[PDB]
Amino acid sequence: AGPEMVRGQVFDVGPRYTNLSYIGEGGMVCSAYDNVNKVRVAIKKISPFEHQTYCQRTLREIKILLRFRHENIIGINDIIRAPTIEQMKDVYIVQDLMETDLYKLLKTQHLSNDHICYFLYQILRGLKYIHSANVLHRDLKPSNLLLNTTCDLKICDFGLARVADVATRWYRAPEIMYTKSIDIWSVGCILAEMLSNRPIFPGKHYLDQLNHILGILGSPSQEDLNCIINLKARNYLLSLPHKNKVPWNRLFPNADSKALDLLDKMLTFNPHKRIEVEQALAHPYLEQYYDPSDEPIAEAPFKFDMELDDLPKEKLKELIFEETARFQPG
Numbered sequence: 001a002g003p004e005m006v007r008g009q010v011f012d013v014g015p016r017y018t019n020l021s022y023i024g025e026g027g028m029v030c031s032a033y034d035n036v037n038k039v040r041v042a043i044k045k046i047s048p049f050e051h052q053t054y055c056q057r058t059l060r061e062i063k064i065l066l067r068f069r070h071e072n073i074i075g076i077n078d079i080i081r082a083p084t085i086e087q088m089k090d091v092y093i094v095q096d097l098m099e100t101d102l103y104k105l106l107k108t109q110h111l112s113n114d115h116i117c118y119f120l121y122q123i124l125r126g127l128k129y130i131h132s133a134n135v136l137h138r139d140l141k142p143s144n145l146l147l148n149t150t151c152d153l154k155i156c157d158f159g160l161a162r163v164a165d166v167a168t169r170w171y172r173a174p175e176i177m178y179t180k181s182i183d184i185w186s187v188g189c190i191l192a193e194m195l196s197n198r199p200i201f202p203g204k205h206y207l208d209q210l211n212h213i214l215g216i217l218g219s220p221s222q223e224d225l226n227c228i229i230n231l232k233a234r235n236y237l238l239s240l241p242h243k244n245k246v247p248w249n250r251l252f253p254n255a256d257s258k259a260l261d262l263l264d265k266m267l268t269f270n271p272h273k274r275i276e277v278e279q280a281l282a283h284p285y286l287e288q289y290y291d292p293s294d295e296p297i298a299e300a301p302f303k304f305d306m307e308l309d310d311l312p313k314e315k316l317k318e319l320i321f322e323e324t325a326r327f328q329p330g
């Protein structure tokens with residue numbers, strides 16, 4: 001029958017994966033029937049060989065998700081690519097099929113405080129495991145939080161993930177305009193969005209993003225501004241007129257006072273004064289779900305065998321070909 005196709009684009013995943021149907025982009029992402037495990041799966045087509053940045057982003061995700069094994073993190077079941085390096089133009093990552101994402105859910109559904117509390121717990125449960133491995137997600141947002149029929153949550157897209165030592169603007173920490181705290185900020189933005197079904201900081205650009213943050217948190221203090229900050233960004237925020245702090249209960253008068261207290265501690269301008277993943281799970285708002293016994297952590301910190309940023313384009317393609325060879329027949 002030949003290689004399969006979806007919306008005028010090759011999707012050569014057959015004969016194992018058949019009956020394809022489009023979902024979205026991230027390249028193209030489809031659902032497919034697996035003839036071996038007799039279930040429908042998710043398949044992400046990646047075409048990254050034009051740019052060295054897309055190759056290292058693809059390699060980092062594969063290496064991280066193959067090492068990671070946690071209920072609140074999407075794994076990798078299979079990887080399809082050409083039998084020879086010359087013909088390898090694409091990489092197909094096969095993962096578990098989820099019903100929806102948090103972006104599509106919040107666009108059509110109102111969440112009860114109980115559902116908000118359970119989603120937040122699972123995000124922080126999964127983040128606890130990520131952070132214990134000394135890994136930063138760097139792009140936590142509603143579209144990266146997959147959900148199943150029974151409301152179970154999984155974190156996906158580890159392309160922008162780096163080892164602890166570019167992102168979606170709305171959920172991007174002020175310090176970026178680096179460390180584990182940037183992911184807490186992003187979870188803060190996700191919590192605020194779950195409470196009102198709209199983004200708390202919808203900036204059109206980097207400047208508008210900062211103005212939206214200051215519009216709620218108020219003008220930053222001397223200690224907030226004092227850091228290894230961008231000279232242009234510092235002078236801009238100093239030139240801006242005074243902005244008053246909007247109390248959290250004024251933005252979400254409906255919301256649980258415990259949910260707001262946690263949101264305040266997560267949406268802290270200063271990343272050093274910001275709440276960490278453990279103290280966040282231990283917060284009185286999440287006591288119904290907090291269980292240190294059933295919250296696994298990584299065995300050892302994650303580390304790359306080599307500096308991927310220094311490797312030339314050709315060696316990077318060979319590494320992708322080598323890392324994916326384990327899923328080849330042989």
Ligand SMILES: CN(C)c1sc(C#N)c2c1-c1nc(Nc3cccc(O)c3)ncc1CC2
Pocket residue numbers: 023024025026029042043044074095096097098099100101104143146156157158
């Ligand atoms: C949102 N989306 C298309 C993306 S980007 C993406 C990445 N990285 C994934 C998925 C995905 N999605 C789904 N399911 C899903 C998501 C949205 C709508 C829908 O009907 C199903 N299951 C597994 C996955 C696998 C991982």
